[PDB]
Amino acid sequence: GYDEIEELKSKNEVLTNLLNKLIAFDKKRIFLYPVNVQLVPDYLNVIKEPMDFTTMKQKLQNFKYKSFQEFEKDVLLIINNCYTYNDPSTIYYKFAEDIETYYKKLNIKIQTKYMNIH
Numbered sequence: 321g322y323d324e325i326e327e328l329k330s331k332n333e334v335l336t337n338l339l340n341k342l343i344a345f346d347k348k349r350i351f352l353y354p355v356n357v358q359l360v361p362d363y364l365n366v367i368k369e370p371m372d373f374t375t376m377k378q379k380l381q382n383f384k385y386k387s388f389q390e391f392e393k394d395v396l397l398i399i400n401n402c403y404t405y406n407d408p409s410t411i412y413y414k415f416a417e418d419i420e421t422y423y424k425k426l427n428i429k430i431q432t433k434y435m436n437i438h
Contacts, residue, residue, distance in 0.1 A: 328383055330437050335391050336380055338430045342395065343373050345422050350415050351398045355405075366405050371397040388434045395423060 346352060352373045355363045364370065371394050385391045402416035 327437055331434055332380055332383060334434045335385055339376055345419055350412055363405060367401050369397055370401060388431050
């Protein structure tokens with residue numbers, strides 16, 4: 321009903337705002353789009369569950385996230401895919417450590433705002 325969809329739309333704004341903050345933090349847009357297999361041929365040989373912020377945006381648009389954990393799962397998948405694929409000597413790896421540090425500074429407060437709606 322009306323209350324269920326209003327809750328969904330309000331929970332979506334909370335997740336959209338957190339996602340937008342993660343996209344803005346990613347200045348070089350390293351996680352904004354799917355890794356191009358034409359430039360990185362072995363990426364899917366290494367990464368079983370690829371994820372990016374544009375995919376996450378498309379999921380929010382379809383109201384595909386029905387829990388904070390579903391959202392957080394994709395965030396940490398983006399970060400952990402970066403640690404799995406790249407060497408720690410690369411900037412990609414440092415970028416993943418920085419977004420993980422930034423995300424961990426935000427997540428507790430965003431998770432509360434999310435839960436209060438229900």
